[PDB]
């Protein structure tokens, strides 16, 4: 086993049906239908001496925490004490030895001709390499291309409620800090269920859905604790993240750095609250809604959201924010 060629992991039927959706420093994102269900494929370069896309290759023991936290966050959606379906499930992980097949290369070329990419052409890579394959379940369209597609303010309220509830269960269960909620990292999926079930510490509750479901992805820079041991990544020696400008998302990194005195190994749940603040900032300024604001009740909820935005920062944690702020009662 181990480094098998991509033929076994990806048979011809799935290769011809791959559409390429996203990109990043990590690697590639592909979409295909397998077992009569659309599944997401993420493939990354591993254990190479070469330099690609402005960074050298990553090494295996540094990518192990990624899969550990992914499989741990996947499993909690079945636990009886604390449960929610706000995460993406793990299907399979393997290792691939070889080069890049031409079909998905032409698919990337199609994407580049349509919208474009900021990375290099992955055609120089030889047979002797290794690769990593990630199978995730389809989430939908992220918030970044859905700016002109939301229904009204009630949908926004439900979105914030679902995000806050999911993070609350995450913290109450596994003491989680994910730290990278930029608005291109939340997934929306159409649904028919009218209400959602979430239980924290053995007490159940229900949330209106308005026909949408929310999930979180891209946990490459998260922290977790389990059975006295702590899993995370130390980023205290690379400062290009804290030199950003032009957006509040660039500022929040330096803000949490100020908060945690440059100690990434501590549990500071307040860090998530600033991310919720940032998300609320986008929902009030960088959004356009189909429906106007004429109905008095929707004016009321608009005032509620404004007060929530301006008075969240006095609050301690996500769970306390869930059980204390006036929005959710």
């Amino acid at each position: 086993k181990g480094p098998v060629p991509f033929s076994h992991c990806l048979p011809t039927e799935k290769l011809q049906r791959c559409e390429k959706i996203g990109e990043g420093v990590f690697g590639e994102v592909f979409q295909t239908i397998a077992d009569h269900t659309p599944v997401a494929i993420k493939i990354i370069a591993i254990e190479g001496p070469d330099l690609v896309n402005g960074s050298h290759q990553k090494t295996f023991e540094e990518i192990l925490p990624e899969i550990i936290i992914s499989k741990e966050l996947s499993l909690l959606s079945g636990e009886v004490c604390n449960r929610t379906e706000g995460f993406i499930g793990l299907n399979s992980v393997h290792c691939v030895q070889g080069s890049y097949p031409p079909l998905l290369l032409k698919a990337w070329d199609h994407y580049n001709s349509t919208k474009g990419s900021a990375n290099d052409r992955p055609d120089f890579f030889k047979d002797d390499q290794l690769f990593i394959v990630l199978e995730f379940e389809f989430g939908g369209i992220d918030l970044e291309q859905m700016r002109t597609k939301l229904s009204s303010l009630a949908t926004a309220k439900s979105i914030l409620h679902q995000l806050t509830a999911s993070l609350a269960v995450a913290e109450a269960s596994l003491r989680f800090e994910h730290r990278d909620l930029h608005w291109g990292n939340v997934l929306l999926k159409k649904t028919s269920l009218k209400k959602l079930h979430y239980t924290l510490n053995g007490k159940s509750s229900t949330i209106p859905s308005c026909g949408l479901q929310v999930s979180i992805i891209d946990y490459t820079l998260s922290r977790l604790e389990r059975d006295g041991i702590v899993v995370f990544c130390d980023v205290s020696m690379d400062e290009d993240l804290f030199t950003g400008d032009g957006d509040y998302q660039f500022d929040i990194y330096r803000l949490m750095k100020k908060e945690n005195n440059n100690r990434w190994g501590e549990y500071h749940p307040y860090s998530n609250v600033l991310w919720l603040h940032y998300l609320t900032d986008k929902m009030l300024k960088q959004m356009t809604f189909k429906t106007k604001c004429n109905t008095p009740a929707m004016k009321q909820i608009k005032r509620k959201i404004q007060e929530f935005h301006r008075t969240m920062l006095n609050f301690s944690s996500a769970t306390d924010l869930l059980c204390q702020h006036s929005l959710f009662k």
């Binding site: 930029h182 490459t220 032009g246 660039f250």
Partner: peptide, 4 residues
């Protein structure tokens, strides 16, 4: 993204 994470890095500008």
């Amino acid at each position: 993204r994470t890095k500008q």
